[PDB]
């Protein structure tokens, strides 16, 4: 069953931006309803935990700028696994998240902190979301080769040979 | 970065050869056939080298992660960013291999091994045929 690749997949939510608008405060809230947000990530678990509790270079800059991002670490350091964190922000139109997974290897002999490993690239441009360059290059080259093949077969069709002259047109 | 640098220089020379063959085809008068053959063969073998070198360094290209510059403004250059970002094939090639697969259409595996044995048999047969007659 034909599936559109998620790298080119682009979601638009006019109702959400009309109701709430685009801001770093609710950029994760905007991302929550997208298909790219896995329901198995610990961010959703933290979300239900918060809901239950209520019912009952630029990395350091964005680190020190917002306190909710602080709360994100102090709620995310306890849970290791696939997590969604912000990468960088330039207002009022550009935001990009950092898709990384954490394995808090607390074993004896490792003086390093929890291991952070990239998984995917996500770019929020306007109200749209974008998600390999190797594929782009090979696709461009192969389409170029197809066009070249068509041109060369047409040119060879145009070619006419005679023994007494050689090849002419 | 070294692998992508080599890819850069080789693709740049390939694009230069493409520009060449372009501005010698754009003339209203067609040059001699032989010059066209030389240009075709050179550019096409250069494309082969491009393919081979891109094959060699897939790991370095895959390991790299794309990220826009902090200094690069997206508000004014979002069109330029989207131009390079898009990667979907041209449609005509798409329905091209769709019709190709339509025409082509444990059983598949044993046909695959039957193709293996036909290939090996044909190779051995032509080796024998070449050995039959002295070509030196």
């Amino acid at each position: 069953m034909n599936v559109t690749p998620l790298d080119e997949l682009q979601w638009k939510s006019p109702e959400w931006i009309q109701v709430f608008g685009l801001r770093t405060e609710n950029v994760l809230d905007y991302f929550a309803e997208s298909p790219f947000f896995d329901k198995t990530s610990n961010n959703q678990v933290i979300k239900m935990q918060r809901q239950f509790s209520q019912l009952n270079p630029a990395r350091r800059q964005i680190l020190f700028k917002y306190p909710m991002y602080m709360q994100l670490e102090e709620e995310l350091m306890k849970l290791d696994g696939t997590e969604y964190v912000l990468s960088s922000v330039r207002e009022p139109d550009f935001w990009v998240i950092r898709k990384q997974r954490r394995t808090n290897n607390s074993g004896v002999g490792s003086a390093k902190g929890p291991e952070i490993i990239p998984l995917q690239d996500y770019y929020i441009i306007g109200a749209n979301i974008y998600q390999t360059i190797f594929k782009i290059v090979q696709s461009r080259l192969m389409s170029t080769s197809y066009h070249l093949n068509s041109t060369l077969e047409s040119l060879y069709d145009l070619i006419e040979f005679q023994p007494s002259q050689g090849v002419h047109y | 970065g070294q692998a992508l640098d080599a890819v850069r220089m080789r693709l740049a020379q390939l694009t230069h050869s493409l520009r060449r063959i372009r501005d010698e085809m754009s003339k209203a008068e067609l040059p001699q056939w032989y010059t066209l053959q030389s240009q075709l063969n050179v550019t096409l073998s250069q494309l082969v080298s491009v393919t081979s070198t891109l094959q060699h360094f897939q790991e370095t290209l895959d390991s790299t992660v794309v990220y826009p510059l902090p200094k690069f403004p997206t508000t004014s250059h979002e069109s330029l960013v989207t131009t390079l970002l898009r990667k979907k094939n041209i449609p005509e090639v798409d329905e091209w291999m769709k019709y190709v697969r339509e025409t082509s259409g444990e059983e598949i595996e044993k046909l695959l091994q039957q193709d293996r044995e036909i290939t090996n048999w044909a190779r051995t047969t032509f080796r024998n045929e070449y050995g039959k007659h002295d070509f030196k």
Binding site: L9, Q10 | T15
Partner: peptide, 25 residues
């Protein structure tokens, strides 16, 4: 040095083929 740089071969007129489909909520 550099014998000649490459001519700008930008094609902004290219319409692109981005598939758009997950718009409905």
């Amino acid at each position: 040095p550099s014998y000649s740089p490459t001519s700008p071969s930008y094609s902004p007129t290219s319409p692109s083929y981005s598939p758009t489909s997950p718009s409905y909520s």
